[PDB]
């Protein structure tokens, strides 16, 4: 497969996961502070 495009797709998944994980992290603090 084309490497540059493949790397681009991997970066999108990686960054999207970070947003989800950081979204989970702040939700964890909010419920802990509930």
């Amino acid at each position: 497969s084309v490497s540059e495009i493949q790397l681009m797709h991997n970066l999108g998944k990686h960054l999207n996961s970070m947003e989800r994980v950081e979204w989970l992290r702040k939700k964890l603090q909010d419920v802990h502070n509930f």
Binding site: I5, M8, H9
Partner: protein, 49 residues
């Protein structure tokens, strides 16, 4: 006209092959030409020792 969701940085499926496949099709063709070009180089040098 199919997904139009956020940035195109993400892959929505097999549609990436629209661009990937032609690029790959070029590499093999170029590779075949490369081997062929080496063939004549091996032939001509054989003709002149």
């Amino acid at each position: 006209t199919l997904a139009n969701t956020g940035c195109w940085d993400l892959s929505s499926g097999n549609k990436k092959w629209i661009i990937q496949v032609p690029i790959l099709a070029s590499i093999v063709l170029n590779f075949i030409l490369f081997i062929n070009i080496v063939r004549v180089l091996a032939t001509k040098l054989r003709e002149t020792n």
